[PDB]
């Protein structure tokens, strides 16, 4: 089978705002995770065709990845910081769901999640 279309990253019908928290999510959180040595499996939608994973999109029905999150942030797609944090959580939980405890890919996600949570603990109060 084909891959699904990627998640939406722009919708001109959606209102936009910039907030200090969304700025921090792009400029600090996403920038820090992106450069991590384990970030590469998470930087774009899973290409189940190229990776030969016929069951991936049978199991993962709410796909998410950092490439999508980056594009959402750069497009001002998100209104609330919590939408973006939810997308990161979806990405990490999808990894845990598809794979098994102690798999290398799971240890990679665990390391990125720990860093994510450290950076979110420093999320500035909304202004
Ligand atoms: C976000 C994500 C979540 N879970 C997975 N799990 C996963 C994906 C592919 C897997 O394929 C096993 C056999 N292939 C591994 C490389 C040779 C053939 C096994 C597990 N991959 C993910 N992303 C991913 C992205 C690019 C490449 C790869 S990979 O195919 O190189 N698989 C890993 C070695 C990283 C597990 C995986």
UniProtKB/Swiss-Prot annotation:
There is a cross-link at residue 58 (Glycyl lysine isopeptide (Lys-Gly) (interchain with G-Cter in SUMO2)). Phosphorylation by CK2 disrupt the intramolecular binding between the bromo domain 2 and the NPS region and promotes binding between the NPS and the BID regions, leading to activate the protein and promote binding to acetylated histones. In absence of phosphorylation, BRD4 does not localize to p53/TP53 target gene promoters, phosphorylation promoting recruitment to p53/TP53 target promoters. It is found in: Nucleus; Chromosome. Residues 17-123 form the Bromo domain. Ubiquitously expressed. The record marks 99 as: Acetylated histone binding. The NET domain mediates interaction with a number of chromatin proteins involved in transcription regulation (NSD3, JMJD6, CHD4, GLTSCR1 and ATAD5). Interacts with p53/TP53; the interaction is direct. Interacts (via CTD region) with CDK9 and CCNT1, acting as an associated component of P-TEFb complex. Interacts with RELA (when acetylated at 'Lys-310'). Interacts (via NET domain) with NSD3, CHD4, BICRA and ATAD5. The interaction with BICRA bridges BRD4 to the GBAF complex. Interacts (via NET domain) with JMJD6 (via JmjC and N-terminal domains); the interaction is stronger in presence of ssRNA and recruits JMJD6 on distal enhancers. Interacts with NSD3. Interacts with NIPBL. Belongs to the BET family. Chromatin reader protein that recognizes and binds acetylated histones and plays a key role in transmission of epigenetic memory across cell divisions and transcription regulation. Remains associated with acetylated chromatin throughout the entire cell cycle and provides epigenetic memory for postmitotic G1 gene transcription by preserving acetylated chromatin status and maintaining high-order chromatin structure. During interphase, plays a key role in regulating the transcription of signal-inducible genes by associating with the P-TEFb complex and recruiting it to promoters. JQ1, a thieno-triazolo-1,4-diazepine derivative, and I-BET, a benzodiazepine derivative, have been tested on tumors with success. Treatment with GSK1210151A (I-BET151, a I-BET derivative) has strong effets on mixed lineage leukemia and promotes myeloid differentiation and leukemia stem-cell depletion. It is linked to Cornelia de Lange syndrome 6: A form of Cornelia de Lange syndrome, a clinically heterogeneous developmental disorder associated with malformations affecting multiple systems. It is characterized by facial dysmorphisms, abnormal hands and feet, growth delay, cognitive retardation, hirsutism, gastroesophageal dysfunction and cardiac, ophthalmologic and genitourinary anomalies. CDLS6 inheritance is autosomal dominant. This is Bromodomain-containing protein 4. The chain holds residues 44 to 168 of 1362 of the full protein.
